[PDB]
Design a protein around this ligand. Structure first.
Ligand SMILES: Nc1ncnc2c1ncn2[C@@H]1O[C@H](COP(=O)(O)O)[C@@H](O)[C@H]1O
Ligand SMILES: CCCCCCCCCCCCC/C=C\[C@H](O)[C@H](N)CO
Ligand SMILES: CCCCCCCCCCCCC/C=C\[C@H](O)[C@H](N)CO
Ligand SMILES: [Cl-]
Ligand SMILES: [Cl-]
Ligand SMILES: [K+]
Ligand SMILES: [K+]
Ligand SMILES: [K+]
Ligand SMILES: [K+]
Ligand SMILES: [K+]
Ligand code: NA
Lengths: 58, 297, 245, 242, 49, 242, 49, 99, 58, 48
């Protein structure tokens, strides 16, 4: 449609699929998010990555 | 123009945030691959070094002989919108007749959702959150009864005049948004955009809102983030005479189009006050259940 | 080759022969603020080497009964060197940090420190003990400066949250039988592009013993923990007279 | 007007309904979103991060709470003695409640996947030892001795330069998902037991402490997922919050 | 006015008309008046089997 | 009929809802619109027009109200004396309330942008002088002397054929937008201070007045915008208007 | 709003009506269906036994 | 004296950085500012009264009786527009009756 | 659609984007206006324009 | 804390027995004459 880009998520690296009947996008439904994940950001934020097979400290 | 070498070769000004990780699509739980016995020197998946700060990289396949399993279990219900886009109670407003609090037929509620533990604990899992919201207002008498009464709800942003009576000129509402609805009608419901002057709301602000000496008397301001203060929600019975009925307005909030950053430990002590992490020092409890011995169930 | 390291920045160099790799918080390196994220219009000042260097600020003694301590950033540095001066003369500041916590012992001592970085580390009080008094922590407890501050109730991080889950934040451990230091690189974290170095602490550094220090009578009993840190990509704006708070 | 007919459900307010509501501020544009480090997209991202498991969940006095975070090992008699035990059920009352995984787990009715517990030895460099860590799938009672424990899934841990070892609690279930286990018929969903035994002995030379501690870190494997979103068992408030 | 709430196994069952559990921040609840038509919702297949 | 189901919000009257309503006069065509000069399209067009800033907001008696529109300068002692000061917060009580910018600002919760104040000297042609006008960004207390003021953003003004000078109050904020500042925690959004000092001295020959006035005109720069439309703090009526 | 007009039948609950109702658990995916012997599709299958 | 506002900009008065401003100007359009319903009239229909005890009332259409709305439209000399009128009726206590 | 050109804005130099269900256009929503501005009309209505760099009176 | 503000090296004892401190050439003049107490202290290199 031809509405305003008011949504809190405009410019998100994951695209949503929503429904709306108003000129303001933030009025839209939550829709469906995209299913990407990045566990490493929290679980493995090391500078020099080590393998599963290796001894972590060498 | 630049001519000395250190200036030419410097990285001062690089605006690109070098990122070590990237997101991959993961719509289902990972599968399991067939594995067999490994009798090897040099290869040692089981041994880790937690000191590094990373979580173990060992997998089922490398610790036991596994079969192949095609896992089609979905990861959809654990998205931020799935977890948060469920309406929960964030405010209750009383409008009694003969009362100590609001006997004048109107009430002003400073928008702060930290008064109820269920909702609060969930949002406090993150430091910053950005989202839109759907607010629903459920009104009735204290017995849950529905009466033929007309109400006006008005959103008063910071700086707009807060009403001081059921007859305040501010109810003319020529610019603020107001909703007029009867108790007999279904709950009123509206959409709210992300309104902070900041890129996100933040449940934690380690600082002070102003400069100066931070003497004992202005210590109640530690942690106060004006960027989270969206204003006042005002409600009144619409009349020049007192209403015949006592009322209660319950406010529900459903977040949508959510983004969150910086996860943190989850609250493990009872909450005591709104937007302040104080806990009762004399009643510090363990996070969970306890037992008599470590060698017994 | 992962146990050995050298960190050189500015006119300062750190060496370690018992390291455990390096953590880059949230997986990203410090960077300067982009022209699209920025909002203030004055041209910033980026002093470079005079402020992005290692400053050794404090030494605490690890005792068999220590509870743990915390420091607030950038508070620990607001009164030190050219960085401090810049933080005082400018309204706006932004920077990342390289934190290097040091602690060595002997192959006969033991114990493990958890070293972590917690953004927006808001401190709570015990609410009069009974929880009926709405008290607030004093300035000296919220912004302790270089001396840091000792935790009263480490189990709940003096904020009603479990230290058992603090590992969800960028961290390393100093387990004496393994390493003698922790190195964590932290990018600028905030919901604004720049902020006040005085009014707002972006994160707190926690050093907490989880496995108590221990050793036999006769072994060196003084085991210091020293804190060294370096701002990275420092930027300042909104110049006027110097202000300390 | 256009002929319509109202159906049941009319006028109801379902808290989980994903509808469209009138916007209060027309033409309002929000503050732009700058880049902020640490964005999370799925709770599962957090479930893979190890947090401290309170295997030693016995001390309860405020001054000793920190002792719950680690448990000990010390020189024994070489009889393959028992060091510690705990249930592997992640969403059950007990040790797991200390973990972020356990807490997040509380917002979901069902879960599925493998778990992992990484144990870090914090004794002195001169201390050596071999421990046997076992996972006993459902139906097996608490092992009475090491010989019985040894019949299940297990890891034999050798202390050395690598301070830690990982015990994988592989997903071995009859059902695709387990609901939270608890005493009673829901024990049907129990995951099983973890027991730690001395394989040889904790050995140390003259001059080094006779007792040392182990810290346990737990998280979920990449095949872990949760479903049927629900409210957590705890509500952290007593009266109204002021 | 009534409130119906679905409490899955493990969620806190309310023990009074004023239970904190009625905050319903995660469980699904329906608020409806007796004067309204019957409330109606769709439920998926929920067994672990 | 076609199956429908009513959702919450049904029957409510939201004052800002942009809906469609039945027309009362079918086939009615309005009077044509002739050309009229001065059409405005956006309030921002008005915010760029300079209006008089009451720096001298002290006299309050009806007969002296006009004195608020200008402030004086006169021969001094050459000690870099202070001439005047005021907060730069455009939507705060004070001098800015006299400006159209300040008034329009009152209908918006948040604003962002650079401001400008142009000072016009109205002394005689024979009067000369140099003034230092400074803008002190947040955190800096009111400058005690010219030397302290001089450390911030400033302009050194020389009287001459060009009667006026412009001081730009550049947007220097931590946040992208500021809400209206006021005493209390909202001082977090303060813009800062403007102070005027004698750089040299007001000099005049024999025969010309020893005192003259300066008129200040203020407006917004082209990067200025406002958001979150709200009602103004003032309601200009006491009882009913008859 | 869009002009509508309610017709008889409005608000009634017909037990055999095949309508659409709001889902209580958004984004919920059920346990997969493994193969189970003996699926029946029509009662007539049973009438021939 | 010329009658125009200053043409000086940030760039020419101080050393500036580059800033990409994406802040919208949409909320300051005339329709944004004015298309918000405000009170412009109140009509009483009392039973035992001095004013309208006869069960009817006539109101001369004039919106200048309420200051909020009035002050806003008086910012301009001429205005041309369409309008949406909403009528909220109830008893003086805010009650709804079958009338 | 096929309605009457009743709107108060018919013949405006800025085009709107609205919704309507009636034969009279003035019944339509407010929609979205076009974002043009002309500050100069009020802020710089001089006959002979002067530059930023020049001395305004020469 | 004062020393730390200048050029420095933080040395960790381990397998590598030694560490090197570089005293970089930081002078106003291209050459220094021999420094000694008095006006020739102008040529002093500094302190370790
Ligand atoms: N953290 C994760 N959680 C769930 N599924 C994953 C994860 N990582 C990878 N996968 C799945 O496994 C495949 C990639 O395997 P690989 O190339 O070895 O990383 C993809 O098709 C994903 O669907
Ligand atoms: C017509 C009535 C509309 C009602 C308007 C509701 C606006 C609510 C905006 C959502 C704000 C999110 C919560 C923000 C901050 C927290 O509650 C606390 N201040 C944290 O300190
Ligand atoms: C079925 C009932 C419909 C009600 C009809 C309402 C018609 C109102 C037309 C809008 C007129 C705009 C206001 C015009 C003038 C001012 O109020 C004053 N006269 C100024 O002197
Ligand atoms: Cl469980
Ligand atoms: Cl302001
Ligand atoms: K898969
Ligand atoms: K709705
Ligand atoms: K309508
Ligand atoms: K239905
Ligand atoms: K632009
Ligand atoms: Na390994």
């Amino acid at each position: 449609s031809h509405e305003n880009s008011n949504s809190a998520t405009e410019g998100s690296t994951i695209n949503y699929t929503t429904i709306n009947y108003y000129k303001d996008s933030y009025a839209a439904t939550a829709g469906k998010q995209s299913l990407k994940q990045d566990p490493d950001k929290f679980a493995n934020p090391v500078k020099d990555i080590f393998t599963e097979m290796a001894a972590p400290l060498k | 123009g630049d001519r000395v070498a250190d200036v030419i070769e410097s990285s001062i000004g690089d605006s690109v945030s070098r990122a070590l990780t990237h997101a991959l699509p993961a719509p289902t739980g990972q599968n399991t691959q067939v594995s067999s016995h490994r009798l090897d020197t040099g290869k040692v998946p089981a041994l880790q070094a937690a000191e590094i700060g990373a979580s173990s990289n060992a997998s089922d396949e490398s610790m036991i002989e596994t079969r192949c399993v095609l896992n089609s279990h979905s990861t959809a219900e654990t998205t931020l919108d799935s977890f948060f886009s469920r309406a929960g109670l964030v405010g209750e407003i009383d409008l009694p007749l003969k009362g100590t609090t609001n006997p004048n037929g109107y009430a002003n509620w400073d928008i702060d959702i930290t008064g109820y533990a269920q909702m609060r604990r969930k949002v406090e899992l993150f430091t910053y959150m950005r989202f839109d919201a759907e607010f629903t207002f459920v009104a009735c008498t204290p017995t849950g009864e529905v009466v033929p009464q007309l109400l006006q709800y008005m959103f008063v942003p910071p700086g707009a005049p807060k009403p001081d009576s059921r007859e305040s000129l501010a109810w003319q509402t020529a610019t603020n948004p107001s909703v007029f609805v009867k108790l007999s009608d279904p709950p009123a419901q509206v959409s709210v955009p992300f309104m902070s002057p900041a890129s996100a709301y933040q449940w934690f602000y380690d600082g002070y809102p102003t400069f100066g000496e931070h003497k004992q008397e202005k210590d109640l301001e530690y942690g106060a983030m004006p960027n989270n203060m969206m204003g006042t929600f005002s409600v009144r019975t619409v009349g020049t005479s007192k209403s015949k009925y006592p009322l209660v307005v319950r406010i529900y909030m459903r977040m949508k189009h959510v983004r969150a950053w910086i996860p943190r430990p989850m609250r493990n002590q009872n909450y005591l006050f709104k937007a302040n992490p104080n806990y009762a020092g004399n009643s510090i409890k363990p996070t969970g259940a306890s037992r008599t011995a470590i060698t017994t169930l | 080759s992962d146990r050995v390291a050298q960190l050189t920045i500015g006119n300062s160099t750190i060496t370690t022969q018992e390291a455990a790799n390096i953590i880059v918080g949230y997986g990203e390196w410090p960077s300067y603020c982009s022209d699209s994220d920025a909002t203030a219009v004055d041209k910033p000042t980026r002093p470079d080497v005079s402020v992005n260097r290692f400053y050794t600020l404090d030494t605490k003694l690890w005792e068999k009964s220590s509870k743990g301590w915390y420091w607030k950033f950038p508070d620990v540095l607001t009164e030190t060197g050219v960085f401090g001066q810049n933080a005082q003369f400018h309204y706006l500041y932004r920077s990342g940090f390289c934190i290097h916590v040091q602690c060595n012992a002997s192959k006969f001592h033991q114990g493990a420190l958890l070293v972590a970085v917690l953004p927006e580390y808001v401190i709570g009080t015990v609410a009069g003990g009974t929880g009926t008094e709405d008290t607030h922590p004093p300035y000296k407890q919220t912004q302790p400066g270089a001396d840091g501050f000792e935790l009263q109730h480490p189990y709940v991080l003096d904020a009603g949250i479990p230290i058992s889950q603090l590992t969800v934040c960028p961290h390393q451990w100093i387990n004496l039988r393994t390493n003698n230091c922790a190195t964590i690189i932290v990018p600028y974290i905030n919901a604004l592009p720049f902020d006040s170095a005085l009014n707002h602490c972006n994160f707190g550094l926690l050093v907490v013993p989880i496995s108590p220090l221990d050793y036999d009578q006769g072994a060196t009993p003084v085991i210091p923990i020293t804190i060294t840190l370096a701002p990275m990509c420092s930027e300042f704006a909104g110049l006027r007279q110097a202000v300390t708070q | 007007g256009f002929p319509t007919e109202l159906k049941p459900g009319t006028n109801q307010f379902l808290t989980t309904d994903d509808g469209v509501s009138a916007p209060i501020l027309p033409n309002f544009h929000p503050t732009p979103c700058i880049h902020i480090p640490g964005e999370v997209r799925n709770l599962l991202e957090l479930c893979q991060v190890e947090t401290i498991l309170e295997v030693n969940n016995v001390p309860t006095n405020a001054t000793s709470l920190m002792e719950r975070l680690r448990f000990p090992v010390s020189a024994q008699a070489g009889k393959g003695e028992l060091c510690a035990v705990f249930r592997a059920d992640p969403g059950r009352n007990g040790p797991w409640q200390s973990t972020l995984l356990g807490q997040l787990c509380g917002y979901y009715t069902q879960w599925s996947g493998s778990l992992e517990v990484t144990f870090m030895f914090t004794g002195s460099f001169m201390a050596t030892g071999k421990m046997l860590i076992a996972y006993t799938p459902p139906g097996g009672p608490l092992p009475k001795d090491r010989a019985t424990a040894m019949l299940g899934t297990h890891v034999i841990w050798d202390f050395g330069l690598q301070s830690s070892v990982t015990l994988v609690i592989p997903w071995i279930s009859n059902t695709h998902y387990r609901a939270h286990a608890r005493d009673g018929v829901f024990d049907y969903y129990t995951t099983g037991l973890v027991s730690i035994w001395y394989q040889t002995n904790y050995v140390v030379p003259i001059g080094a402490p006779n007792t040392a501690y182990i810290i346990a870190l737990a998280a979920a494997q990449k095949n872990f997922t949760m479903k049927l979103c629900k409210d957590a068992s705890d509500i952290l408030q007593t009266g109204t919050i002021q």
